[PDB]
Amino acid sequence: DQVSLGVVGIGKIARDQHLPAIDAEPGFKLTACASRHAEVTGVRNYRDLRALLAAERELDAVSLCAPPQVRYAQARAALEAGKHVMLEKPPGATLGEVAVLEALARERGLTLFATWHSRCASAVEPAREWLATRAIRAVQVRWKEDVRRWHPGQQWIWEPGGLGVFDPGINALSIVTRILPRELVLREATLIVPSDVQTPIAAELDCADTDGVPVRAEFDWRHGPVEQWEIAVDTADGVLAISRGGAQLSIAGEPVELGPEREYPALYAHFHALIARGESDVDVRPLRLVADAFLFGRRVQTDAFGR
Amino acid sequence: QVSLGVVGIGKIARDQHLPAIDAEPGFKLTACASRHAEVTGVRNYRDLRALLAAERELDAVSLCAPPQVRYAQARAALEAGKHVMLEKPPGATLGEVAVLEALARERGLTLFATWHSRCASAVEPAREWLATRAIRAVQVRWKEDVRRWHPGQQWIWEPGGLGVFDPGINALSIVTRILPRELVLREATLIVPSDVQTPIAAELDCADTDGVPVRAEFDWRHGPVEQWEIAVDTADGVLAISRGGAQLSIAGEPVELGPEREYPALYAHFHALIARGESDVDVRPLRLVADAFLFGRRVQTDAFGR
């Protein structure tokens, strides 16, 4: 059962991750693309989503890969036009817009899928199963990378709604909220904001789950001595250590063998299954935690980043 | 009679909560907790922990302190088996309110996130008039001198204290009650004095799910005019709420209202929720403010002076 698919926003994530994953998934037929960049070979091309929707009435689904600040208008137009919708993360620039999109999709009988690619990393499900029945003592997240190495020349990240360092940091939060059994409350946050941008370049979160387990997180996009994408969960049965952003796992000091990394193949497989079953999948809890940090966090100005 | 403790005895507690409680025979004011002066005629405590330990029979608590301490207080009260009424905003974050609601539901206790402005007398007549009408646009103007209306307050300037969204969320609580469809924030601008953490002025550009534009201007700076107005343009004329919800006109004609009794109405509703075994936790006004802090552009302005 082939689902015809359009991709909206042909940036580097689309070309590097989405198009290769789609082209390797038999359940989808890549039919159309929309962007203002180079024409994509082998599909029908459009420069905006309005033109794509007007010319592709039979199209089944769209996958949205553009920056989050345009996500609501695009997803709304796609749902109004009768298409199933897959969202890159974060699923919106605000929480209200995601709630409205979910309600609209449910009313129209269409699949809406808020994706979290890091939740499909190979360590996540083994970690979730190991932690389900165990006494958890503390969680530490360290998510540090040089923005100039990992997001060279990107500007939407610095604009209102662009998350700054919570762009990678929400990936860590999407893993934490999937592997931990209880919900998190933000007790304190500090956001470090360069004077020439609108979003933080570094942040610290102090959270607690509903049993009082301390959950601390450090996100940093400044140049530093180490790049690391680590989540450590201390338990009465030893430390569970996720590293390499979810691609590496050790439990009580022992490495755990994992399946190969296939985050975006797993996302598209799940999108196809959601469509097939008439279901949606919209978990906004990672975005709610980020919203709480922007609402409750203390802001500290720092020197200009240089854009 | 529901035995009631009040937590946080500042001037809103002294001027609004206690008079409303004392005039409502459905409650018996039993205990107060505050680090400030003792309250006369009740048992007094310096903190909620001591109150809970000494008042095991107590039925309910009403939390009136700043929102930055409300989660720890409400959680302790729910863990102690008390029904809980929250001043607005119901938390400093959305996650804490979701956790409190789930805890209350698991324990079989009433949790009530109050919005005093939703009980202003214009609100229900405005909601009923707008329910079946074609709306074209909404304008909110909520402007007051902070030094007049919140003199000497500091929590408003600290992280989680909302700044001008302290009164502004009252306007949003009215708008989200009178309008039939949900709102999406499209743009916000927050003006933040260099010596505080929260905005002193803000503009919001929203749209409802039919595309109706909903614009709001909030300002705490000294200005020529103080105003607390919501105007809804419709195919059948303008609905105009003024005086914070204490005055209403529809299509150019004044509308008779009942007495302005926001806090009496809140406590009556809390009593009814307890009696019916229900909770009432609408966080949509806070979600809109969260969206403004997450998506809004921030502009520094001159120091406020505190």
- CATH level 3 topology of the largest domain in chain A: Dihydrodipicolinate Reductase, domain 2
Question: For the largest interface in this structure, which chains are involved and how many residues does each contribute?
Answer: A-B, 30 and 31 residues
Q: Describe the largest sheet of chain A.
A: 9 strands, mixed
Q: Give the strand order of the largest sheet of chain A, numbering strands 1, 2, ... along the chain.
A: 14-13-12-11-7-10-9-8-15
Termini separation of chain A comes to 47 Å
What CATH first level of the largest domain in chain A would be assigned? Alpha Beta
Assign an overall shape of chain A. Answer: globular
Q: Helical amount among residues of chain A, as a percent range?
A: 25-40%
The domain count of chain A comes to 2
Output the radius of gyration of chain A. 19 Å
* Element string of chain A (H = helix, E = strand): EHEEHEHEHEHEHHEEEEEEEHHE
Share of residues in strands of chain A: 25-35%
Summed up, the helix count of chain A is 9
Total beta strand runs of chain A: 15
Task: Label the CATH architecture of the largest domain in chain A.
Answer: 2-Layer Sandwich
Q: Structural class of the helix and strand makeup of chain A? A: alpha/beta
In terms of quaternary structure, the protein is homodimer
PDB class: oxidoreductase
Keywords: L-arabinose metabolism, NADP-dependent dehydrogenase, Gfo/Idh/MocA protein family, oxidoreductase
Assembly: dimeric
Entry title: Crystal structure of Azospirillum brasilense L-arabinose 1-dehydrogenase (apo-form)
